């Protein structure tokens, strides 16, 4: 079983066919944050291609802004399948929310309306040909922004649900996987050089460092588990100035497993740094485990969207 996580910086704008694209990357499930896609745009291209079951969410708030994708081969068409991180935008469901008393409503509502995460949860064959359920957060964490200091704190909060989410779906059993742009790159290494000498100090850092658990935190790095030392091993490059010739880069592109799943289940994860057409690049999982796929799309696949119906139902 094969996953790839991609900022794509906008489906469209890779000017290349996304089937062309999601084929090349040769995987089960295919995670995709920034794909620019809202509803408005009735963009059936860019969320149906054939071969494919497709999850989107999108945002609620600008046209052609965030947005994430989560695309499955028939091998691997999940069970359930959400919006979100909190059931504010939820048959066919996956449940498991974690106490979230400590927001309002209204802060549930604002941090999942921006297309920043979606989840479908697989069935899967363990390494004893057991049947466990695999919970796949595809997420793009926001970002703060100087002259909006509200923001900062939004995706604070952002990575507060994130970790209630993903830690209640553990609790219940089985498997989960977080991946995606989480926007912080978590030590020295994950950075050009030069490193500061209160570089904890960022509390998106902090947040990691308590998040992941080293080979305290229930997730493990998987790059890492698998290639703790490697140098230069970044994910993102600014568009100007030819950073990506230079190597002036950071990894912010994670697959995060729980530490079972990576112990037992994973065989590699690596940075897919040839794969060109957006800012970042892939990251890719190879797992031993195969999946069960489910009968039937649900409810949450693009495929049941009225828009794109089609002409017989015209
Ligand atoms: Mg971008």
């Known amino acids: ?38 509803r408005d745009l009735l963009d059936e291209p ?29 091998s691997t068409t999940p069970q359930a399948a959400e919006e979100g991180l909190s059931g504010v935008f939820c048959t066919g469901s996956v449940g498991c929310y974690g106490n979230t008393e400590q927001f309002l409503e209204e802060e549930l509502q604002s941090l999942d309306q921006e297309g920043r995460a979606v989840l479908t949860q697989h069935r899967i064959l363990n390494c004893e040909d ?15 922004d100087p002259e909006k200091p509200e923001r900062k704190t939004y995706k604070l909060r952002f990575y507060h649900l994130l970790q209630t989410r993903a830690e209640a779906i553990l609790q219940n059993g089985g498997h989960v996987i977080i991946l995606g742009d989480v ?27 308590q998040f992941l658990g080293d080979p305290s935190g229930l997730f493990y790095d998987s790059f890492r588990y698998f290639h703790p030392t490697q140098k230069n091993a970044f994910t993102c490059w600014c568009s100007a ?27 590699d994860s690596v940075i897919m740094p040839e794969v060109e057409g957006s800012d970042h690049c892939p990251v890719k999982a190879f797992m031993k485990c195969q999946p069960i796929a489910a009968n039937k799309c649900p409810p949450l696949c693009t495929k049941y969207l009225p828009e794109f119906a089609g002409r017989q139902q015209k």
């Open 241 to 267: 100035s030819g950073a990506r010739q230079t190597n002036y880069g950071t990894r912010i592109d994670y697959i995060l497993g729980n530490r079972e799943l990576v112990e037992s289940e994973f065989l």
């Open 130 to 144: 057991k049947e466990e359920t695999l919970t796949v957060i595809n997420v793009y964490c926001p970002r703060a």
């Open 183 to 209: 926007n912080t790159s978590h030590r020295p290494l994950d950075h050009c050089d030069p490193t500061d000498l209160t570089f904890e100090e960022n509390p998106g850092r902090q947040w990691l460092n």
């Open 1 to 38: 079983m094969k996953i790839v996580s991609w900022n794509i910086n906008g489906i469209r704008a890779t000017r290349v066919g996304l089937k062309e694209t999601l084929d090349s990357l040769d995987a089960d499930i295919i995670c995709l944050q920034e794909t620019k896609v809202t």
């Open 46 to 74: 860019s969320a149906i291609v054939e071969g494919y079951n497709s999850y989107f969410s999108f945002s609620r708030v600008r046209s052609g802004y965030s947005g994430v994708a989560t695309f499955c081969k028939s």
